[model samples]
Target chain A: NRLKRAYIALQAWKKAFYSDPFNTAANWVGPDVCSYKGVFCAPALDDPSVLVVAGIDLNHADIFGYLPPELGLLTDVALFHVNSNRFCGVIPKSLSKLTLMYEFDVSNNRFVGPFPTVALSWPSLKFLDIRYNDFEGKLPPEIFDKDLDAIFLNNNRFESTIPETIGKSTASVVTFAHNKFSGCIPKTIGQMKNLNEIVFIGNNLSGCLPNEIGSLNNVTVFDASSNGFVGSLPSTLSGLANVEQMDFSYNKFTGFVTDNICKLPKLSNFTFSYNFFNGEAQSCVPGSSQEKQFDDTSNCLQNRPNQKSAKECLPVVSRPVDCS
Target chain B: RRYIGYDALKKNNVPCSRRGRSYYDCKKRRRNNPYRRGCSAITHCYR
Candidate 1:
């Protein structure tokens, strides 16, 4: 009965598509919905003797279509990955019934409107990737409270402050780059214990990064380039004993690079170019690959090529950043 | 030479990850030719 329901749902979805350049429409010509190109079936969780549609992966299919409301009939589905497609329009509200869905990746599509809050109600969801879309507006604070392992929401039109509750997220990776996120990297983010990577490039974010950022001993890669962040590098950054790649290019950062950060055990690829930084430890000398690989170009550093002029550095390097 | 039809041209605004490891690296232009545009990177794309 569940496969029958899936068959009806899939047929309706095939009919809803405006075009199918990948020829998924041509191959989906049979009654066996379980044998469909992107479909997968497994024994029903409730009844091992009965098989049902359990997953759907249409990644990179480039199918120009929209999901039909009947897709909610695939109640036994656990994963639904349909990224890099031309699927447009709002996700069908009936999809809220997919309670067993643990992974939902609908990125790189033309889906517009506000953030899909429907996934918030999905208790089984663990990994959520909705990047490369046109979803706009502010992100609800509830996203931080979710128990997901990873959250990707970059390159969208999101315009809001990262809620302080970000410290509560259990994700290992969190990306919010190339958006319109403003305000500080919340001080509470130092409380993130499971974070492994965080990206904040080309956003409107400002203010000094919290000293507690060093608490992320687990992070291997961290980027906050092309923003409005001010103030000196945090000394507590030495706490990142495991960080390998760190970038702070194209910003308003000032002060000097300390030995502690330059000497991190695993630190490599440390770039802070195009900033107002005025000083650096001897170990961080430009073109010196004896230790860590760094790029300190276009900074306020004295005697360095491609750096800001003394006149440009004076008002900036000395400017008072009245922040904590 | 790889041919890009009108449909592929629409994806010029879409940035693709070289290996799709980090969403941060997905900032590079999606075009696959010498005449690429908007070839931006957010650090990991170079690594």
Candidate 2:
């Protein structure tokens, strides 16, 4: 019954927002609140709060519309979704009012302008995605404060330096790829104690990867591909114990990837391709399976292989000597 | 099981009213749903 109520509530949104007169396909229906289609009804016929609507898919719906502010009315909504639509303008400020919202997605739409003033403090909010839109401006420095298991902010007009606040948050997965962000990767990022994955691909960020990055002891997946980071990786990375699947591809990073990765107890993949790194590739701290993949000609002194090596081992290698 | 890459969005077949599409314009129709849309003004056109 909850599932049905949730579905009905979603349709209400479709009807109210789009104001469709005919109320055709559940896919095309805009907003209406209670009578909207595709929503399931309560089985018990008593519980009003239990109309469950699991998926709120609106991908490629050609929905050339701005989300109505009333969408916040779907209080029981768990998945607030909309992908590849014509939805333009800023996200409605009302959605921020949904404290019970869980999965949030609005990718591949026409939404533009700065991220809303929405303070994603939802205790239930887990997955946050805002990819492929015209949304610009700095990401909130405090995003790491949430219980996010995954945070995707890719392919947008996002700009500015990464805030140090993230380095201290506890999110498991964080991505800020394919944007216009500038400046060095935040040095404070090294403070993410529980961080397992972090990325900064395809942007204009410059400066050497910070040495403090080695502090991400729990790092399993790290990437800074297609950027402007320069200089050799930090030798301090040999200290990480759980690092695996690391990449520094397509950047200005130079110097050799050393033997530190080989020493990693759990490392398995590493890469440093398409850069000016000058070191002969060599395994560092061979722990799990480094000797199995280390090649004879692979330079390990001046520069490390970029993404190409990520398949072999994820050594927490860095070239942060360039960080000032 | 963890699921990624959800189903892609499809196109809407609803035809727009040519006589200065007023409240029915897809954009105007979805004027208040914050869950799917961001903040913006109503661009409704009156004939």
Candidate 3:
């Protein structure tokens, strides 16, 4: 009965695919669902003799279609990877039935509307990648409360301020760049003790860099480029002894470029280019090339005479948002 | 879990509209870099 159920699910799955350029689903016929492309089966946990789908990896088969709700019937699936496809529409809510779902990756696809927050109900969810999609609306605050190890939600239409609850995240890598995130970087983010990289580049984020950020002792790359942040670099940033690449480029930041930043041992590429930073700019490590280090030359307070006044360089207003 | 083969992105040129910079940068980092981080406005473009 288990195998028969899986067979029926696969048949429905194959039928949902609107385009299968590679004929990837051509052989998905009959009861031998285990042998089908992108499907993997293993002995069911309950009954060792019974086989159940454990993983569905259709990563780049270039299939174009929506995943039918029948996919949720594969309760044993630990990883369901469908990235880089033409799949659209919201993720099926029925997927919450997968108690063993460990990883759900559907990045680089056309999934629209708010993320299927129902997936958050999966207790075993550790990794989630929904980047490069059309997903919009404010993410539920509970997203940061999860025990996920990694979360990638960049290059989407997600808007609103990142909740302060982000401090609750256990993720090693959390990327929310290139979205519509506004307001300040929540000061609570300083509580993420295990964070390795916090990539928040290319957004509508504004206000000062929270000094609490210095609390992230393990952070390696802190990219906040192409945003609307204003004010001096937090002095506590000098505390990031492990930071390698820090980009604060294309923002409204002003005031002294801290000498301590130049002293970060592992900092290789430090770019604050196109900001209104004034006062003295610090030097970089000996071998670091000029391109690897950039600062506002045409603006700032005094060092660069050819530049505009620091006041003239700040962005006129908040970035306008058009959700159309 | 990822796009296969760098050859496909290279063949299409992916018409990155904002600047002359091709999708090669995104594809390259995505395929090779350990971080697999970076942004592209082109991919978010619905039109």
Candidate 4:
């Protein structure tokens, strides 16, 4: 009886935006939520009600306007997602009412200001994506905590130094690209043992690559392109045997390109184009690992004054800058 | 027969049987409630 009342109330709003796909969400939602477009029923059957809301995906649906405070009414809402919408205003404080919520995504919106304090307090949240919004302010000091996994805060108006505490955050993938962040890359970030990727391109970050950065043994993609970082890279970086892509382009890094980068057993693609890297490599090539391997085998490690190109690099390795 | 977490789908406004996912849970319910045989033909045929 209560659910019917809620549905009837929701239908009123559905009628308001009768012509829009997003407004008519109540009709196409499904007779049973299990058949709904962005819902997942729970797996157990101890009761008569479908108590768990496994998913609330609303990606690319252009859900304009503010986030509905009514979402707080969903007691078991989990995996709440609403990317690529025109949503303006603050994420309702009521969103914190979801005790079981896991994945919360509100990326690509017209939202402004800092993330809500209540949002940061959500203990069960894991996946968070607030990228491409108008958010302006320093990141929360404790952005990385337990259960938080992937974070995409790219292309925003955030400022301040990359929090040193980020290394201790629970995320495995973190991107702060295309922001106004300035200052040195926090050396403490090497402590993120599970971090597999850290992309910070097009920022005002300066300073040499921290030696501690080499400790990220699990990293596969590390892009710091278009930053103001200068000085020689830590030679210890060659030890990343698991790396696949490392882009250090458009930076002020100098000195002879480290030879260790070229010989990683799993490396294939290494791009340091448009930088002042001085290495002995005669040329740089592109392609997949097997393709590059076939090219290398077909030509033998060419000793010409130019760099050899290949197509088969798996974890691509950047050529050492020719200092001569 | 079917459990999601804290409550039931009937409360959440979903219109599917708790035991509809598999026949085993339904069979057990049918065995326990003999009067349910006439509720729907879908289950009556299986019974």
Candidate 5:
């Protein structure tokens, strides 16, 4: 019965497209809906006797326009990949009914407005990417409580402090790079036992490095460069047993280079250049000589030749929005 | 008590169970192609 509904859904979607430059929706006619472009049908789990629309992949199809609400009728769909398209307008709230969704990628589009809160209801969702959009406003705090494995919300107009509840997230990878987020990294971040990679480069963040962050034993790469962070590196950072690549460059950090930091077995790229630190590399590894493994120019070191003073390397506080 | 092609069933005015894809399979064999154009047979077969 629902198979017929799926046909109507696709037909309505074809009608909603304002322009199909590649004629991708040309074959979206007739009763054989399975053969439609970017349409995939699979047998339902509970009732394998009947076929259902399980996935829709129209990525890079060059389709211009919004998705039709009729698409919400695809109850069995698990993936909706509409990335790299010209589709604009708000996602229909009706899509919240898709309980079986696992992967939803609407990146590289013209989606605008506040976070789509309805998308938070998908229980089976694992991977979500809404990057490169015009989304704005403070993200709902409950977003960190989802059971997702990875989330990408970068390159948007998102502002304000990341919720402390993010410490409770089960996600392994999260990126908030190139946004308008400002404030101190929450100390509760130590609770994220499963986090592997976190990036916050090019933001308005400030304050001291949270010592609790040393609890991220599984993290591989941690980049917080190009921010307004001040104070010394946390001594607890030496507990990053598994961290490989760390970039805290272009900040206002001023402290001694901890010997524990350079002795980490897996530390490869420990870039802390362009900060206000004046100290030797301590007992650092052989290949980690200054510019090669790290770029520590412009510090207050007396012996280092051609050093730029701390006054020259000021914080980039110019943002599009007022932060008061 | 037997399975007949959708074309034969339509020709003989026999009813279909309208239960599964087997009806589509029967139509496929009868038409020498898998896809169907219209639901004329299905409308009558579903009661």
Candidate 6:
């Protein structure tokens, strides 16, 4: 019954692939779905003796198609990826019927409409990527509540403040770049102890970098450049012992790039350009270290070339928010 | 069942994937034939 149900679903998917320029779907014409391109069959998670369709990867396939509702019949599928394709239209609500689904990636596609709230139904989901699409508006706060390891929602039109409930996510990598998000990074971020890489570049985020961000002791890559964040660098950031790439340029940051943050052992890429900073710790000076890649241009620094003029500095340097 | 990482995609380009073309090139190809939406079906760049 397991493979039989999966075969029907595979046929539905094969029929729905309206366009396949490279003949990616040419071989998807058989009784055995296992032989079909991008389809995989494996032992059922519940019954080792029973085989079922477990994955469907059409990455870079550029298959012009839509997910047929009958495709959801492969309830045992654990992963579904169609990145770099032409799969447009909203995610069908039928996909919520998938019980054992683990990974859902549809990046680099033309899929539009609001966040696929249907994703909230999966209990075993671990990786959710819908990047490089036209998805818009608010992401459901409940997305963070999943036991997801990575959440890639970058390069979309998603707007609104990232939910205050974001800390509930167990994700290790959270990339939300190039969105229309505004408002402060939630202080509740302290709860995400497993976070390793976080990017929020090219957004409209403001307010001081949250002190709670320091709580992510496992962070290795932190990029929040090209935003509207102000105030001094948070001292709590010294807790990022493992951070390797840190970018805070093109923002409204002021005050000194503190000694502790620059002296971090793993830091190699630190860019603080296009800001209002007046000084940097000696550890952050150009030619200070061979291992470091640092940029401090167009700032308010006193004796630096390409630095902002004294006229521009006099009014903004002292505007305060405690970085303690 | 496994992912095709950058290395795998790089190591195996069967002419159609077009790893050499710029993103804008592939993007332009897709744009010219907007209705098809089936440019470079495999081995695409933007890695």
**Index of the highest-lDDT prediction:** 1
- Write the residue-wise lDDT of candidate 6 on A1-324 in tens digits: 667777888788778788888898788765788777777666666676876677777778888988888877978776676778898888889998897776677778889989988888998776677888899999788889888776788889999899988999887678888899999899998898577678888999999998888888877778899999989888999998888788898999988898789888888889999999988988898777899878999998877789998888878886655644
- DockQ for each numbered candidate: 0.04, 0.03, 0.04, 0.03, 0.01, 0.04
Each model's TM-score, in the order given? 0.87, 0.67, 0.81, 0.70, 0.80, 0.85
Interface RMSD of each: 12.3, 13.3, 12.1, 16.9, 22.0, 12.4
Give the least accurate 10-residue stretch of model 5 chain A, judged by summed lDDT. Answer: A315-324
Q: What is the TM-score of chain B in candidate 1?
A: 0.16
For A95-168, candidate 1 gives per-residue lDDT tens digits of 89988867677878988989989888888676687888899999989998988766778888999899889999
What lDDT does candidate 2 reach at residue A306? Answer: 26
Please state the CAPRI-style docking class of candidate 2. incorrect
Scored against the native two-chain complex, candidate 1 gets a DockQ of 0.04
Best by TM-score: 1
Give one digit per residue, the lDDT tens place, for model 5 in A1-324. 788888988888888889999998898889898888888777676776887777777767768988778888888877677767788988888888888877677777789999977689899776677777888889788988898766777788899998988898887667787789999999899998577678787889998888998999987778898899887788899889977778888887875777678767677777777777666564542344543365566555555654565455333211111222
True contacts kept of 4: 0.00
What TM-score does chain A of each model score against the native chain A? 0.97, 0.74, 0.91, 0.79, 0.91, 0.96
DockQ of 3: 0.04
As for TM-score, the candidate ahead, 2 or 6, is 6
Put down candidate 4 lDDT per residue, A66-98, tens digits, no spaces.
656665655555555566667678877876776
**Each predicted model: what fraction of the native A–B Cα contacts (within 8 Å) does it retain?**
0.00, 0.00, 0.00, 0.00, 0.00, 0.00
Cα lDDT, model 3, residue A23: 92
lDDT for each of the candidates? Answer: 0.77, 0.57, 0.70, 0.58, 0.71, 0.75
Kindly report the docking quality category of candidate 4. Answer: incorrect
- Give the winner by lDDT: 1 or 6: 1
lDDT of 5 by residue, B1-47 (tens): 11111122121122222211222123433222112223322222332
